[PDB]
Amino acid sequence: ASGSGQSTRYWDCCKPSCAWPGKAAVSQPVYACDANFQRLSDFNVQSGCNGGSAYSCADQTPWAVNDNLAYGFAATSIAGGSESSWCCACYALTFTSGPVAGKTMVVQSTSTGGDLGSNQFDIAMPGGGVGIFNGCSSQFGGLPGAQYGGISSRDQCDSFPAPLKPGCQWRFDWFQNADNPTFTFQQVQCPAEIVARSGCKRNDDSSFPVFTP
Ligand SMILES: OC[C@H]1O[C@@H](O[C@H]2[C@H](O)[C@@H](O)[C@@H](O)O[C@@H]2CO)[C@H](O)[C@@H](O)[C@@H]1O
Numbered sequence: 774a775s776g777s778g779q780s781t782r783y784w785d786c787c788k789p790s791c792a793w794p795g796k797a798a799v800s801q802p803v804y805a806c807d808a809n810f811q812r813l814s815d816f817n818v819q820s821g822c823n824g825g826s827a828y829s830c831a832d833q834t835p836w837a838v839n840d841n842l843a844y845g846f847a848a849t850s851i852a853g854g855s856e857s858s859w860c861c862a863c864y865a866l867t868f869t870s871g872p873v874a875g876k877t878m879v880v881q882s883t884s885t886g887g888d889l890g891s892n893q894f895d896i897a898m899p900g901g902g903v904g905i906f907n908g909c910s911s912q913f914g915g916l917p918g919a920q921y922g923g924i925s926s927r928d929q930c931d932s933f934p935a936p937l938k939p940g941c942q943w944r945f946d947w948f949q950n951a952d953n954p955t956f957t958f959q960q961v962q963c964p965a966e967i968v969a970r971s972g973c974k975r976n977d978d979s980s981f982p983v984f985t986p
C-alpha cells in the first residue's frame with residue numbers, strides 16, 4: 774500500500790481486532806492484556822468491550838525515537854484492503870498538515886472500526902478518546918477526556934493509570950497536540966521494536982521496503 778490518508782486519535786481499552794487468531798497470516802496475533810495490563814497467553818479471550826476480560830496492552834502505545842520520528846500503533850481501514858491485508862502491517866506516515874508536518878511516524882495496524890473511512894488511521898494514544906465503546910470504564914473505571922478526542926491539556930495525563938501515562942504525554946510532547954493531521958503513507962517492513970511490543974509480524978512483512986528514516 775501507499776497513498777494519502779486522514780488521521781484521528783483514540784484509546785478505548787478494547788481488545789484490538791488483530792489480537793484475534795485467524796485475522797491474517799501472521800507469526801502470532803497481537804497480544805491482549807488483562808485489566809492490570811498483564812499480557813494474556815490465550816489469544817481467544819473475550820474482549821472487555823464485550824463482557825469479557827481482555828483489553829489493550831499499555832505497551833502498544835506511541836513513543837519518540839527522535840524529534841522527527843515516532844513509532845506506534847493504529848486502527849486502520851485501508852482502501853481496497855481488509856483485515857487480512859492490514860492486520861499487523863506497518864506504515865510509514867509522513868504528516869502533511871499541523872505542527873507535525875514533515876515528521877514521520879511508523880505505525881503498526883492492530884485494529885479497525887466500523888466508523889473509519891477509507892485510508893483512515895486512528896492513531897492510538899491514551900487520552901485520544903474512547904469513541905463509540907468505553908472499554909476503559911470496565912477496565913479501571915474510565916479515563917479523563919471528551920468521549921471523542923479525549924483530553925485537552927497535558928496536565929490531565931497526571932490522572933492516567935501509570936502504564937498509560939507515557940503514551941498520553943507523547944500526544945503533547947512529540948505530536949504537539951496535532952489535531953487530526955493529514956499524511957501520506959507507505960507500507961513498510963515493521964521495525965523490530967514495534968513487533969516486540971505487539972508480538973505480531975505478518976508472513977508478508979519482508980515483501981515491503983525498509984522505511985526511509
Ligand atoms: O471515529 C473515529 C475516532 O474518532 C475519534 O474522535 C475524532 C472525531 O471523530 C472527529 O470528529 C474529531 O472530533 O476528532 C476526534 C479526534 O481524532 C475518537 O477519539 C476515536 O475514539 C474514534 O475511534
Ligand SMILES: OC[C@H]1O[C@@H](O[C@H]2[C@H](O)[C@@H](O)[C@H](O)O[C@@H]2CO)[C@H](O)[C@@H](O)[C@@H]1O
Pocket residue numbers: 785787788789790793820822823884885886887906
Ligand atoms: O468485541 C469483539 C469484537 O471486536 C472487534 O474489534 C473491535 C475493537 O475491539 C474495537 O476497539 C473497535 O472500535 O471496533 C473493532 C471492530 O468492531 C473485532 O473485529 C471482532 O472480531 C470481535 O468479535
